[PDB]
Amino acid sequence: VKPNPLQDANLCSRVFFWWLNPLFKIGHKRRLEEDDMYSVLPEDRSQHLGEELQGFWDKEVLRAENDAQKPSLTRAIIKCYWKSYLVLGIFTLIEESAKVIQPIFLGKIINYFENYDPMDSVALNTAYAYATVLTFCTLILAILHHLYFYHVQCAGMRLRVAMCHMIYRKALRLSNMAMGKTTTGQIVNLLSNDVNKFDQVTVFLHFLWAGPLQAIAVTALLWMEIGISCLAGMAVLIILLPLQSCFGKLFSSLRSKTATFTDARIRTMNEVITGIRIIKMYAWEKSFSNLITNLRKKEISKILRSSCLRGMNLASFFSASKIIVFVTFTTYVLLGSVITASRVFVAVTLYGAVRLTVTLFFPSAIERVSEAIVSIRRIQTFLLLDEISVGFQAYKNYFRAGAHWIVFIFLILLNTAAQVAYVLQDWWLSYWANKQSMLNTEKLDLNWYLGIYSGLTVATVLFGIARSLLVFYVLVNSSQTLHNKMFESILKAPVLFFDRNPIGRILNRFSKDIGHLDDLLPLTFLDFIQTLLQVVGVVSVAVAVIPWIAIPLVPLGIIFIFLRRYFLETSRDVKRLESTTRSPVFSHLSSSLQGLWTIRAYKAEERCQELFDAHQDLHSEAWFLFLTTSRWFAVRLDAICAMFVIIVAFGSLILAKTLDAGQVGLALSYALTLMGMFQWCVRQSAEVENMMISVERVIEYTDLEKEAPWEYQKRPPPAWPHEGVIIFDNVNFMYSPGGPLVLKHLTALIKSQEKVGIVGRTGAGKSSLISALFRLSEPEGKIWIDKILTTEIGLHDLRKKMSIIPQEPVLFTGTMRKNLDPFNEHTDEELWNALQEVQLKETIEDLPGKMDTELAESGSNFSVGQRQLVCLARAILRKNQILIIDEATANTDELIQKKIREKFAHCTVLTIAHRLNTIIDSDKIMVLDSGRLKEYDEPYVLL
């Protein structure tokens, strides 16, 4: 078999995941697909994880049968996993306690500088001991975390597999009555949505008791440093939840209304794409163009609001750590106390450690727990049933379509001001402390030191709001101006492009790509640039204090790109394997659920169970590698993330003779915040690169084949169609520009006021005659019509003066006046008379409006004969001479036949039909053989 290297692995070697190096060396050049992966542990099989849980559930229900109660499911899970829960509780408690000693010892390190005696060597050893003790908390938080995390992630796949196994085992013991109420889709949804929520609960499970405990532990430390003023720092930290709740409940309605706005546009686009030939033959593009541009305008107007709202939310979240500090220190100074460089940075670090933790971990845990509880409830109620008896060009083309270069210069200038204010606000406090420590009465005026502080506080908020608003506007305008180009380019493609591509593809494109361009790109781009700027500023303020940190950063900067490449060259394969191993189990379940009686007939039912287990083992095996390949990177990242802090701390301590307390405190208070921002910045790039494919495939359009322009410079006479004699020459027709031919030298002569019939074998090139007269594809040879040709005339000047009766009618979703008159050029009485003389008036009088009747599902209220009659009404209302009647039916018809035989004023009627009983007493007839056409003068000669 395939023995995994996880077993037989000593300690101090699986903390760095050293047993995964060879696998990468295989995935560097060979692109391993499926046969070079490791199997699962012997204690991770489906049967071993399902049998014990089934036994525990049976024991629990047998115990609950005694009392007059209902058996529960969460008790059976607790009684099985309480050991693992209690084992992980110790480590999560240790990790939560290890985040409090760091500020307490940073305070002592700074206090050593506050009382500095050069003629001493005893306090330096104690300072070195403080630094050594501070060095261990970082190592515990950065190294020993990526193993507990892997274990707490692996502790959920077992529960998921057990639930799936027991659900499938129960599903094969249902009766006919119990099977009649449930459906296959219901079971598929219950297995693909309810169970899959058991992988993100164990991660956010320890944030219900360790959340408030850390807050209470931090709230009591500040009383021993600054006093009552610390409460001022906690009053602002509460308003964030009511601030975000209203934002969410206001954004939901905007999302709903913009969705209900774009749904109609999607439907109209689907209607337009299907049936492009009739629309192109009738020259009815402007109506749909306007109907689409109006809905697009409304959709953009509704999206701008939510965009601005989310931008304001991000701007408010970016600068919440400044108001708290400003308020608490203003209150602390206004009482009468004096500022010190050892009590400010400790409070800053504690605030930064509590606010992000609470506001990012507590709100999500409640939602996760509620979802898990409702899923467990659903699965419990189910189991109680009866039984039986890209490139840089892709970015340039997307950015240069939003504004000029001066706007980009202004945005670059505005990006580097909020961060400068963010850093200067902190530097001002260190300057204050240094100026205070130089005293030897002679107090300091508060006006200057408070006014400058308030100004530096306000500037940050202003420059944080303006940048976000500008970025969101610029990035929405690009999609707004790109959709129009896409639609205008696709509204002029030939039929050749339309017949070689399905409708579902283009519809899914127009929906999903525009959704992605309007929903997820600006948020991700703003988050990425903000998180990158924060890290750049942190590194800059760390280097500006010690000019020697710039030397080791280059070796710590070259390896990062190489590691990123070496990981991404092989990390883009596990998701594909996960998908192609998750699909077959669903396929097997769907195929085996319907074929139930064939399994109960034969005395073999456990074979399907073994097959299901063997199918799920492959998915478990393909999923096992995902967690390890994900955790193999965080260790190498946190290594540098902690080495930087160690280096800066020991370098600041070694050079204790040429600096002071304020600047060393400022330098050390920033190094303890690099981890989360580093992780977010290195993570968002993957999503950006994955989402750029939408832009890639959108720019794929707008550069396609283009037919002849709609109009030329030369204009036809005001009344061109008159005595519509039509001649031909040696003409050759073809569908592809370099493909085979379908006609061979069609030359005839059709005079005026003649009924020319065409009789030929189907599929031998009979319907290819109408596509040559309407020049849907440029043919070969001259086609003279009314003393002029058909090539030097525009398409709209040609297709307008002719009429064609399609083989099958089509009705567009709209009113009654639109389907008969999209361009308002005729009166209402004229249309009423034309509809009366076609013998159809009673079908519309019974309707309420009789003139503005809305039709559902392309006119589902009318019959086929009414469709032929309304097409005839359209043809009569057009009132042209050249009329092409093509019809092939198998079926009301006698009246339309006699009408088209009498109503039309004998204007060059030609027919393309196969029914010989319709070509009777025609002026001229033509016969089609497999390649050519033969014209007969009189039909009496043939008969």
Author numbering: 8 to 396, 696 to 746, 756 to 1206, 1211 to 1262
What's in the article?
ABCC4 (ATP-binding cassette sub-family C member 4) is a transporter protein that is primarily localized to the plasma membrane, and its efflux activity is associated with the progression of various cancers and the development of drug resistance. The ABCC4 protein primarily consists of four domains, namely, two transmembrane domains (TMDs) and two nucleotide-binding domains (NBDs). Structurally distinct from other C-family proteins, ABCC4 lacks a TMD0 domain. ABCC4 can transport a diverse range of substrates, and its involvement in numerous vital cellular physiological processes has been well documented.
On the basis of the analytical structural data, the resolved hABCC4 protein exhibited an average resolution of 3.29 Å. These structures revealed that the substrate-binding region of hABCC4 is a cavity formed by helices TM2, TM3, TM5, and TM6 in the TMD1 domain and helices TM9, TM11, and TM12 in the TMD2 domain. The outer ring of the pocket is surrounded by residues F156, F211, F324, L363, L367, F368, and R946, whereas the center of the pocket contains residues Q994, W995, and R998 located in helix TM12.
